[PDB]
Structure 1
Amino acid sequence: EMEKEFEQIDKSGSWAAIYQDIRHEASDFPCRVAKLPKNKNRNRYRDVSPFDHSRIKLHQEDNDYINASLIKMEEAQRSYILTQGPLPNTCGHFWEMVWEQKSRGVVMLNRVMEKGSLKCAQYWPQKEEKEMIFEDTNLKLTLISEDIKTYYTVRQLELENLTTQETREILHFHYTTWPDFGVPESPASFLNFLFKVRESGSLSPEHGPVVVHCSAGIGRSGTFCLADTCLLLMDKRKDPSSVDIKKVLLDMRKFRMGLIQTADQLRFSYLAVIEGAKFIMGDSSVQDQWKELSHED
């Protein structure tokens, strides 16, 4: 069990070493397009770039680059796009990708302001009558409604291709109480939120991959997807002991660098998967426990 390992690592106080072992072992692929001079203003952080092999290309001829990667989890059979928080000049690009990738959901795990700085552009409308137009990408975006909970909010956004007037519904799941380089308040409130996302059908394979972002698209995003894929893997096999969390994280790191940015987010991952396993292994009733613990109203 992951849970014996957890107890071992906790007793020997060795989360930092375990985590460094992963960083050291992590994949190192080229990000030549990210680092082209022309794409300087499309990257939020100098030290966070998509690998060339997994980057999402916009379907445009001017410049197809966005700081986004496709994480394709083969055994689990789930894919995610992970991306940074859109820049003031890449919000058109962001929605271009959502449209082109046919995603149903966007999971946002940061706030616009954190630690007294701006971590992400206001890339979606905050009220119904004030839609956003992205002229560069010829997209309209409209807030259709929102459901504000204590520590997260779900919004229905309408995206219109202004070229064709085709419309799509996007669900936005905005976790608002997950600090940068921090962890969720509890496994229960994390899992409640993850399970909201799943319930919505935004992860389901009849849609494009979900878009996941934090500020860099790696620390909180990586933790969210690691928990999700590990639970999915345990769910298809019904064998918790067969899931090696560290190994699943190295597999995800083949597709984007830097996933899970701190040893405590890794520790937290374990807790989330160990708790989530109760539900996956057929105690349906813990879901509603999670919901009560999380104090969402």
Structure 2
Amino acid sequence: MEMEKEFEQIDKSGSWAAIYQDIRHEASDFPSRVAKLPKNKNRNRYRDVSPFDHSRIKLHQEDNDYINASLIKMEEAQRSYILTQGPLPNTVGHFWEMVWEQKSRGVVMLNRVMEKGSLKCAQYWPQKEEKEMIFEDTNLKLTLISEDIKSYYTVRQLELENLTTQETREILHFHYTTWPDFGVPESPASFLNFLFKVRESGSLSPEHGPVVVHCSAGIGRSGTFCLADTCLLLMDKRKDPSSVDIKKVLLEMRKFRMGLIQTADQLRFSYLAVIEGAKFIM
């Protein structure tokens, strides 16, 4: 079926939970043996969210190459994304090592450091220009260059230096600051505006490594971001845009990381975002 009328048909029939459970039943199951090794317990935020072995990002390190991060490679759309958990106190250095080694330009953050009164990720970037951060375990230096605070999101320019080679690179930090503590946003308008700002920066383009996107577990809000982006790109590429099937795209993405889209409300919000976004593109 088309999207916008399939949408109204699920609303009127109140069957979002059944649709979402079907997706959970059909989703791929691949091994995640490296994630479960005892030496990696303090590298995982949640025991039930792990990268598959076949798509995990490997650190270029002979001691321990593990990070909780997955490469989502979308062949028809010609887009790739790295989805990862919010960094932990003992993985901030690994996080920036990955950004460096994978040649990423942008980092997309969809959570606040504290939500619901608890810490959802480490404070992993510097908050003042004159107070830079040094990650001694991976030999990197990170400096805040500039910060632009808007009503729904903040953009930061960062400098990452590999202290071993003295090479430097500019990284863009795109921080969506207004996702509500419970539920999903009432309108997709600010989320779509944010997606377009990431696009306009070059951070999603083939001349760079894959964008790094995270929330707390790296599957819920993060899944919504890449699912909406990929669906809108396919609607531009194809002769028949109504042939884009959001449930099939989501199942394809779940071949690369488990659990993408965590609730039936997030599924409905993804439909809403793609529907409204397809009108603005034209």
TM-score, normalisation: structure 2: 0.98
Q: CA deviation at 1:62?
A: 1.1
Partner of 1:168: 169
CA distance in 2, matches of 1:84, 1:103: 16
SS in 1 for 2:53: coil
Does residue 120 of structure 1 match 2:121?
yes
Deviates more, 1:45-54 or 1:271-280: 271-280
Go from structure 1 to structure 2 and tell me whether the alpha carbon gap of 1:57 and 1:180 turns closer, same or farther (over 3 Å shift).
Answer: farther
Go from structure 1 to structure 2 and tell me whether the alpha carbon gap of 1:220 and 1:181 turns closer, same or farther (over 3 Å shift).
Answer: farther
> 1:245-274: per-residue Cα shift (whole Å, max 9, x none)?
000000000000000101011100001000
SS in 2 for 1:174: strand
CA distance in 1, matches of 2:162, 2:201: 23
The two structures, once aligned, show a CA RMSD in angstroms of 0.9
Go from structure 1 to structure 2 and tell me whether the alpha carbon gap of 1:238 and 1:183 turns closer, same or farther (over 3 Å shift).
Answer: farther
> 1:151-173: per-residue Cα shift (whole Å, max 9, x none)?
21000010000001100000000
Does the 8 Å CA contact 1:234/1:280 hold for their aligned counterparts?
no
Deviates more, 1:92-101 or 1:179-188: 179-188
CA distance in 2, matches of 1:238, 1:180: 39
Go from structure 1 to structure 2 and tell me whether the alpha carbon gap of 1:273 and 1:178 turns closer, same or farther (over 3 Å shift).
Answer: same
SS in 2 for 1:53: helix
Fraction of identical pairs, as percent: 99
Does the 8 Å CA contact 1:160/1:167 hold for their aligned counterparts?
yes
Q: CA deviation at 1:50?
A: 0.2
CA distance in 2, matches of 1:184, 1:261: 15
CA distance in 2, matches of 1:17, 1:113: 32
Q: CA deviation at 1:178?
A: 1.1
CA distance in 2, matches of 1:72, 1:125: 31
> 1:5-63: per-residue Cα shift (whole Å, max 9, x none)?
00110110001110111011111111000000000000000000000000000011110
User: Runs of 5+ in structure 2 lacking a partner?
Assistant: none
SS in 1 for 2:69: strand
CA distance in 2, matches of 1:249, 1:74: 13
Partner of 1:146: 147
Does the 8 Å CA contact 1:144/1:157 hold for their aligned counterparts?
yes
SS in 1 for 2:111: coil
Q: For this pair of structures, how many residues does the alignment match? A: 281
CA distance in 2, matches of 1:22, 1:38: 33
Go from structure 1 to structure 2 and tell me whether the alpha carbon gap of 1:238 and 1:175 turns closer, same or farther (over 3 Å shift).
Answer: farther
> 1:194-223: per-residue Cα shift (whole Å, max 9, x none)?
000000010011000000000000000001
SS in 1 for 2:20: helix
SS in 1 for 2:208: coil
Go from structure 1 to structure 2 and tell me whether the alpha carbon gap of 1:7 and 1:185 turns closer, same or farther (over 3 Å shift).
Answer: closer
Deviates more, 1:182-191 or 1:132-141: 182-191
User: Runs of 5+ in structure 1 lacking a partner?
Assistant: 282-297
Kindly report structure 1 stretches of 4+ aligned residues shifted beyond 4 Å. none
> 1:165-198: per-residue Cα shift (whole Å, max 9, x none)?
1000000000011135632342111100000000
Deviates more, 1:175-184 or 1:144-153: 175-184
> 1:89-112: per-residue Cα shift (whole Å, max 9, x none)?
100000000000000000000010
SS in 1 for 2:93: helix
CA distance in 1, matches of 2:277, 2:268: 14
SS in 2 for 1:185: coil
> 1:99-128: per-residue Cα shift (whole Å, max 9, x none)?
000000000000100011100000000110
CA distance in 2, matches of 1:209, 1:181: 29
Q: CA deviation at 1:238?
A: 4.8
Does the 8 Å CA contact 1:181/1:261 hold for their aligned counterparts?
no
CA distance in 2, matches of 1:238, 1:139: 46
CA distance in 2, matches of 1:211, 1:185: 26
Does the 8 Å CA contact 1:48/1:216 hold for their aligned counterparts?
yes
Does residue 264 of structure 1 match 2:265?
yes
Q: CA deviation at 1:280?
A: 2.9
Partner of 1:94: 95
